[PDB]
């Protein structure tokens, strides 16, 4: 198991090796949609 990618783009797992952007769902920011 991996932790779900909080980002809307890339793979299903967070810290997808092949992703460089993180499009966050509304109201979140940060490299893992933390704040």
């Amino acid at each position: 198991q991996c932790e779900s990618n909080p980002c809307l783009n890339g793979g299903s797992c967070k810290d997808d090796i092949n992703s460089y952007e993180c499009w966050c769902p509304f109201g979140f920011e940060g490299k893992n949609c933390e704040l």
């Binding site: 198991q1 299903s12 797992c13 979140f28």
Partner: protein, 299 residues
Amino acid sequence: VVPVDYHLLMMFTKAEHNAPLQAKARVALSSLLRLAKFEAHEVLNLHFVSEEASREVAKALLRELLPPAAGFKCKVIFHDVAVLTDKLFPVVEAMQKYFSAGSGTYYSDSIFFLSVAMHQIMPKEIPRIIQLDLDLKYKTNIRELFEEFDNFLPGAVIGIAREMQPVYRHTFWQFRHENPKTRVGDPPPEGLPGFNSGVMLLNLEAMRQSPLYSHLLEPSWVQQLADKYHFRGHLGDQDFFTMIGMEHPELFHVLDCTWNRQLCTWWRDHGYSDVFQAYFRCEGHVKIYHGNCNTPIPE
């Protein structure tokens, strides 16, 4: 009397030195067995998919719980995770890259697709089986779930409850973006929120006998739909059923939410505050609680 067999199947792997999983299993199996009632000529078959260390753990748990109060005949069967993995792999290989954590195709993920090819893994004497998670709490007699098989419309092969979080809202983002009018990923009652694999009525005969279902297993069909839906997941069978459920809802008998009342709220806290309620709502007399994402079950 002609003896009537009932079949349940649970995954129970890597359970040695995993006390949270053993306690989950204990809660599930003890409520299951306390509340089950079967007629004298009926037998409950409990299938476990386990490597050899989890087989011994399960046996220790089961001997403390069997025979059941209600006194009905119960049989335990173990299936080797390594044997099933090898059987599943030719069928399941091509779907793994879309629905496993994360890339690409590993043997260790193959068993998470067991349900999709259960009709080819189980003896043909087994016409139907109910696959269940071990993080459940049964509030009723499991015998009652089996009558849901009778509600399958022509062409339906699998019974399954909806996913109760907007995980598929999130997963289908790009397809939703390109198709503003889609119901794919929307909440009930009118949207298609996807499925949860915690409780599944696998009609093996109907699965075997469905030409549509058989085609959908083929590498190029899996590939075409995952491309159409821009689908990437890590939840295995749940993902595959959810996806082909978007294309071909006729395959699925949707169970009442009360048969699989998911308690996980992880997605509420990860971008879906405003809509979470519309996915999570479940009303009626709860028959099975599902403590998914390690969520403690109320008592």
